[PDB]
Amino acid sequence: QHYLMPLRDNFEQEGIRNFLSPGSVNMAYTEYQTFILEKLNALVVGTDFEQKDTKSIVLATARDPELAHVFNHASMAHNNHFFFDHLSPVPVKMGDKLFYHINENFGSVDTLRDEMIGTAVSMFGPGFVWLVRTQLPGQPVALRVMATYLAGSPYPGAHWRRQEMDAQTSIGSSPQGLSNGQRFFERSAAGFKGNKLEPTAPGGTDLIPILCLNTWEYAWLREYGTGVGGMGGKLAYAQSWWNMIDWAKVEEEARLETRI
Amino acid sequence: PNKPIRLPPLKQLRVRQANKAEENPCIAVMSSVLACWASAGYNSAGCATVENALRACMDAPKPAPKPNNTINYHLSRFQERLTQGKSK
């Protein structure tokens, strides 16, 4: 059975000093993750996924319309830990190679800072904000930001449940509504028929999630509260999160090609 | 009604003619020709269309032999298991 694993640097017992109190990290990971695994175990209690990894379940149950509920828990248990793992105990200085490459794709570190933070609040819903590494067969290693909804997988193999745009406030009668609507139908029809919309290299090497940001309610609703009057809230949570990013690990997981 | 018995121990569980015996098709056309002569006549016109079919049959090339049936090989694998055993 899938069991909980300790966090990176004892965040469960002590928790990050200036980001999340130990009581919050306790309810965020030790209690919630345990709840998800308890539900996940019961779903794969007697199936082939009884010994498979969360990521292996995410890719295997991505398109299956009958295993969508199993994908949520598997995709949620993965993204949740993917977020806490990248957090560092203390501030880390951004690497030269990483810092120099970010400026080529976003212009400056402050541009990417306000983009991910802004994208989180602009979503007005639970999900995850990712910093993806886009590398096509011939194109250079280009970075970009992707915002997933409740339980969305940024991996290319799980493109069936990316959940980027809400189909409630993005499909209407306006020019942008019609355009978004066609895409929503073009994907569903193609996906159902099996046709591939965008080519992807084998092995799912096109996109490699480097950094993540958990914007769910349970993560910050206790530490920073609702955020009435601008004091605290989801906005402050995202801002404070920018001070504990393990840029060292983020740089390693990027695996940028030597271009300096 | 009783069910099929368990065969006694045999020397070999096989079928004599595995692949069916093909019958010469032109022999059937000849029988039709001989039928016309019996009823219509020999130097008649009703057997014209039938006599022509008999000439076209013997002219056409005979078919090719079919691949042998592998029934007897599988019968030899399950003999001791299906029957009482092998005797010799």
Add this chain to the structure above:
Amino acid sequence: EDLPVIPATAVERVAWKTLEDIRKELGEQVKASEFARCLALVKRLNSIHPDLKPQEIKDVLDSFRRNVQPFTNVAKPIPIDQFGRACGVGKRKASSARAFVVEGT
């Protein structure tokens, strides 16, 4: 086994040794069925990508190559004399002819 493979149509044609060659070099009587499955491994290991293929498999695959060259016997073409007469030779059961064919009437 985890290394990638190459589609069959992109695998260079190789002349593998036959059942008789293995029997002779090994001095044994290897069953055709047991060798048929051993040859499949040779064809499978040959599908590995060249750049990724290791040096161990390369040497093991070089011992199964058949270096047999059939004898070449190319007939000589019939020349044409300066005057334009070609000499063809034909025989039938007792005799031998020599026809000198030229452009004419």
Add this chain to the structure above:
Amino acid sequence: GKGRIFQAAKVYQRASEAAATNIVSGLPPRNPPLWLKAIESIPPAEINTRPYPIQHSPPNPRARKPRNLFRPTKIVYPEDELRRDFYRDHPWELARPRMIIELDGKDARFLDWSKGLRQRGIPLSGESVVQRQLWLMENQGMTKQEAYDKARHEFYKLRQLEQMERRIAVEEARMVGGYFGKDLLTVGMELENKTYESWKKWATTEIARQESARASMYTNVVDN
């Protein structure tokens, strides 16, 4: 006598005597086989001795001349009668696949049936209802029917939630831009088409074939 004299159990007794003395009288016996001393103190077990097998059920006491006294008996438990009652009331519960391939055999170590139907390691199936029923019927002193109702209703409330998740999980995914593949209903219909077409080819071929038999019955070779 189609059998052969197998002396595999006396390889030591035989080898021990052949190695005690030398064939060439007047010389010491050569060293024995390397295995003679290894199994010196490991004799074989007694084979071919029919004992009274374990009796898994009270044997018939009224029998005065009982037979089959050396026949292994059937293993029957109190659960066998409950499994038959449940699965007969829920025949389609057998369609739900169940794996009978054990991983390490240590599955009955985490099964505490005083908690509920949901246990660690095993899936929620007709067995969990049986094991839960047997517990209540024995520990709580409930009757077969009483325990059956209680354990049976807990099974439904858990299965209902399973079917509700599939529906909502899909509907919830499309509200945020989540598309899926071909459902089982569509795939099932496409397969029937490929099979129905093959049947159509077989029907038209045989139908035409029967026409020849109907025309061949009568004779019209004269061409009157």
Add this chain to the structure above:
Amino acid sequence: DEEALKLKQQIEAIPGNFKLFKQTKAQTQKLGAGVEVRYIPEQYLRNPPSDASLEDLMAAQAHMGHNTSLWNPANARYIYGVRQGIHIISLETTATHLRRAARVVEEVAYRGGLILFVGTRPGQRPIVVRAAELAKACHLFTKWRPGTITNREQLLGGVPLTVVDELDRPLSGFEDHLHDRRPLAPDLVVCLNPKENMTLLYECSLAKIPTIGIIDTNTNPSWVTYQIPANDDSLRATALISGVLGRAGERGQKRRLEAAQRGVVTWKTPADVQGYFELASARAADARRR
């Protein structure tokens, strides 16, 4: 042109994608939660167990006997009962007999004995070969040629041999002995399917060779010396038994070689090689005198 040129790019991009895919597989493959992997199909080969418990034997289907109709009442001593129309072999009888054979395979290897693991079935080749590696024995995964023991002089005629000392390192000077010496015979055979090959087990009883076999409900238990009541038709129960017996031989060879380093040989020269020594001295005596 542009069609076949695509393959050139893909074929050339496999190395890069493979390396990148291998690196990425080490980053996010294990992040969600720890999986309690308690069974892998290829676990009895990569790391077989030293001793098999009742849970391991049961999980490996080592108790599934044949149909009640197809049974040998001789081996009614290892049957526990009847279920699903088959005979259920006692899990305790299978463990006690398996632990005994492990003690036999261990001592024979401790005395420098030649063991032979014989399993001749479609999928029993990797199991027997792995067991032999551990126990430093010989393997056999094809039809045993009748007469390889009783008629070994002919069958195993041209097969080469070698003479080794206490520490299994070859000795020089036995060139003339390896040409007149007759072929070897296994000091212990371990058959994984005695019901199939009875010609091998008969040559062992006819040549006074101990044997170990997996006796199924329909197998005659009088064909081997040490029976192992278990299911021989299961490919998962045979890999467990072979692993145990394989580890036994390994543990036996370790003691033998570890004792040789201390100048303690656990075996004496066989009779065959012993006779050659006496003849050597006789021929050497002539050189001394003459």
Add this chain to the structure above:
Amino acid sequence: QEKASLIKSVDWNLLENKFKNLNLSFILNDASYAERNNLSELLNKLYYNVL
């Protein structure tokens, strides 16, 4: 091996296949290697010389 047959293959070591033009002019006229003109040098590379 005693009863095994032989596969018909060209033996390029034979003196007939090595030089398809047996004329010493072509063989020695710097066909492939240079300054092997001496007939003795050519023979030494084909026969085992005792001297």
Add this chain to the structure above:
RNA sequence: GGUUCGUUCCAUGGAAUUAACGUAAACCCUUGCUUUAUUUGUAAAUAUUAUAAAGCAGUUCACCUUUAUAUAGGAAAUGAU
């Protein structure tokens, strides 16, 4: 049990593993081709009949079909040769 001109070949058998002879292969004549030699044979000739030493060649390649996936077979003036 299949297959083969063939106890040929493959598979298999609770007994097989092998040796000799016949068989097969090879040999002589004959057939196409290459190189060699040109008299007493050849009109001429830049070599082509003949003479005769050696070497190569087949069911080989292509096409069609193919069992247990192990061993292959068919088509015969309108594929090559």
